[PDB]
């Protein structure tokens, strides 16, 4: 089963850590918790963004150019990436934009963090149809001393 995990701001805008204006350690814990011990696919852009493999997860990088770092698995297509994962219960797609777009029609689940923030950003999460997805989990949290803004965790599974 394919899963997408992402953080969204006002208007489906998503961006990198340093691009991000918020500070949400709880969002981090949630990402950790839901992606640990699972393979995670990401685009070249995200990878460079992160600069180190994520521990306790098999990191598979999607890119068209040959890879330049043996600490991760480099793949050339959606299909290839899916196969390098092997037979596991759940694959996690971590972005970015192009990546999300491509896996979405393959996914059955969406783990999303809704950040009550307005920011101008070059990129967005794909417009998906709500009639096709059922919200099975939801939890709103107010800001606090740790978390800079209010956020909502949500999990939808494809109908």
Ligand X SMILES: Nc1nc(=O)c2c([nH]1)NC[C@H](CCc1ccc(C(=O)N[C@@H](CCC(=O)O)C(=O)O)cc1)C2
What's the distance, CA 16 to chain centroid? 11
In angstroms, give the least distance from the CB of 102 to ligand NAP.
Answer: 6
In angstroms, give the least distance from the CB of 99 to ligand X.
Answer: 9
112: part of which helix (H) or strand (E)?
A: strand 109-115
Q: Is 32 in the site for ligand X (CB under 6 A)?
A: yes
Q: Is 39 in the site for ligand X (CB under 6 A)?
A: no
Given a contact cutoff of 8 angstroms between Cβ atoms, the answer to whether 96 and 116 are in contact is no
Given a contact cutoff of 8 angstroms between Cβ atoms, the answer to whether 103 and 4 are in contact is yes
Q: 33: annotated binding-site residue?
A: no
Residue among 26, 28, 34, 45 that touches ligand NAP (CB under 6 A): 45
148: part of which helix (H) or strand (E)?
A: none
In angstroms, give the least distance from the CB of 70 to ligand X.
Answer: 20
Q: 98: annotated binding-site residue?
A: yes
- In terms of CB distance, is 66 or 103 closer to ligand X? 103
Q: In whole angstroms, what is the distance from residue 101 CA to residue 36 CA?
A: 23
Annotated binding-site ranges for substrate: 5, 27, 52, 57, 113
């Amino acid at each position: 089963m394919i899963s997408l995990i992402a953080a969204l701001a006002v208007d489906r805008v998503i961006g990198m850590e340093n691009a991000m204006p918020w500070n949400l350690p709880a969002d981090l814990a949630w990402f950790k918790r839901n992606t640990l011990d699972k393979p995670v696919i990401m685009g070249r852009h995200t990878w460079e963004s992160i600069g180190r493999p994520l521990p306790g997860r098999k990191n598979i990088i999607l890119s068209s150019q040959p890879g330049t770092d043996d600490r991760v698995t480099w793949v050339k297509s959606v299909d290839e990436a899916i196969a390098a994962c092997g037979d596991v219960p759940e694959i996690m797609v971590i972005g970015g934009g192009r990546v999300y777009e491509q896996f979405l029609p393959k996914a059955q689940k969406l783990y999303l963090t809704h950040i009550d923030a307005e920011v101008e950003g070059d990129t967005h999460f794909p417009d998906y149809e709500p009639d096709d997805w059922e919200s099975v989990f939801s939890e709103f949290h107010d800001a606090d001393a740790q978390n800079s803004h209010s956020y909502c965790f949500e999990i939808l599974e494809r109908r």
